[PDB]
Amino acid sequence: SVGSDQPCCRALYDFEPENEGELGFKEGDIITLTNQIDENWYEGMLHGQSGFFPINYVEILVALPH
Numbered sequence: 497s498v499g500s501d502q503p504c505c506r507a508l509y510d511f512e513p514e515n516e517g518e519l520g521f522k523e524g525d526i527i528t529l530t531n532q533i534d535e536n537w538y539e540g541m542l543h544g545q546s547g548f549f550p551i552n553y554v555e556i557l558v559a560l561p562h
């Protein structure tokens with residue numbers, strides 16, 4: 497398995513993608529966190545796909561480095 501120290505977050509709400517760069521998900525999904533683009537958007541992965549999603553839609557479980 498990937499290490500338990502892999503940055504990740506829990507979706508608190510559904511997010512449906514409205515462009516082809518966004519990573520959609522459903523409430524409760526555990527998203528692999530890969531980057532923070534700005535004060536509003538993360539990048540991450542779920543089920544092998546990658547894309548952007550709102551910081552405000554998730555609960556951090558393991559934070560990216562600061």
Ligand SMILES: [Cl-]
Pocket residue numbers: none
């Ligand atoms: Cl620290």
